[PDB]
Amino acid sequence: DSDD
Amino acid sequence: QPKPGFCVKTNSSEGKVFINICHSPSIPPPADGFRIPMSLGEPHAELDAKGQGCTAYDVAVNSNFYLRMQNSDFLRELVVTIAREGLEDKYGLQLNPEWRMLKYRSFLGSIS
């Protein structure tokens, strides 16, 4: 994921 | 203030929307037309990982209940749909349902  | 739970990520057909799914004993539980006791927080602007802002919403269910449901992928999914429809039934939004649960993140910092 891009945000993690 | 309620304690951090997990962080659901979904778009909103206008932007990135994180549902900070948190928990607090104050909220009543429901178990032991199905609805679930949960607060529906007020929007706060948070920055994504990239560096562009987006809208986070702090939704909180019964805490004791929650530690029971964080083990059930089934319950998991059941709460997220509901809440998404709470944010829809209060702000329109028309959130996207193709949502992801972040592996690492459990919040976008700003409980209240």
Author numbering:
A (entry chain D): 8 to 11
B (entry chain B): 49 to 80, 96 to 175
Give the authors' words.
The R2TP complex is found in organisms from yeast to humans, and consists of the AAA+ ATPases Rvb1 and Rvb2 (human: RUVBL1 and RUVBL2), a TPR-containing protein, Tah1 (human: Spagh or RPAP3), and Pih1 (also known as NOP17 and Pih1D1, but referred to as Pih1 henceforth; Kakihara and Houry, 2012; Te et al., 2007). Pih1 is the multipoint scaffold of the R2TP complex, coupling the Rvb1-Rvb2 hetero-dodecamer, the Hsp90 chaperone machinery (via Tah1 in yeast or Spagh/RPAP3 in metazoa), and the TTT (Tel2-Tti1-Tti2) complex implicated in activation and stabilization of PIKKs (Hurov et al., 2010; Kakihara and Houry, 2012). The biological roles ascribed to the R2TP complex are directly associated with its ability to interact with the Hsp90 chaperone system and function as an Hsp90 cochaperone (Boulon et al., 2010; Izumi et al., 2012; Takai et al., 2010). Here we present crystal structures of Hsp90-Tah1-Pih1, Hsp90-Spagh/RPAP3, and Pih1-Tel2 complexes that together define key structural links within the R2TP core in yeast and in animals and reveal how R2TP connects the Hsp90 chaperone system to the TTT complex involved in PIKK activation.
Interaction with Tel2 involves the N-terminal segment of Pih1 (Horejsí et al., 2010), which contains a conserved region of unknown structure (henceforth, PIH domain). We determined the crystal structure of the mouse PIH domain1–200 with single-wavelength anomalous dispersion phasing of Tel2-peptide cocrystals (see below) grown with SeMet protein (see Experimental Procedures) and used this to phase the mPih47–179 apo and SELDpSDDEF peptide-bound structures, which were refined to 2.1 and 3.3 Å, respectively. We next obtained crystals of a complex of the PIH domain and the Ser 488-Ser 492-bis-phosphorylated Tel2 peptide. The phosphopeptide binds to an intensely basic patch in the high-resolution apo-structure formed by the loop connecting β strands 3 and 4; the faces of β strands 1, 2, and 5; and the coil segment C-terminal to β strand 5. Electron density is evident for the Tel2 peptide from residue 488 to 496, but side chains are only well defined for residues 489–495. The Tel2 phosphopeptide binds as a 310 helix stabilized by a backbone peptide hydrogen bond between Asp 491-C=O and Asp 494-NH and reinforced by a hydrogen bond between the side chain of Asp 491 and Asp 493-NH. The core of the PIH domain interaction with the Tel2 phosphopeptide is provided by interlinked hydrogen bonds between the side chains of Lys 57, Lys 64, and Lys 113 from Pih1, and the side chain phosphate and carboxyl groups of pSer 492, Asp 491, and Asp 493 from Tel2. This is reinforced by hydrogen bonds from the side chains of Asp 493 and Asp494 of Tel2 with the peptide NHs of Lys 166 and Ala 112 of Pih1, respectively. An additional hydrophobic interaction is provided by Tel2-Phe 496, which slots into a small crevice formed by the side chains of Ala 112, Arg 168, and Leu 171 of Pih1.
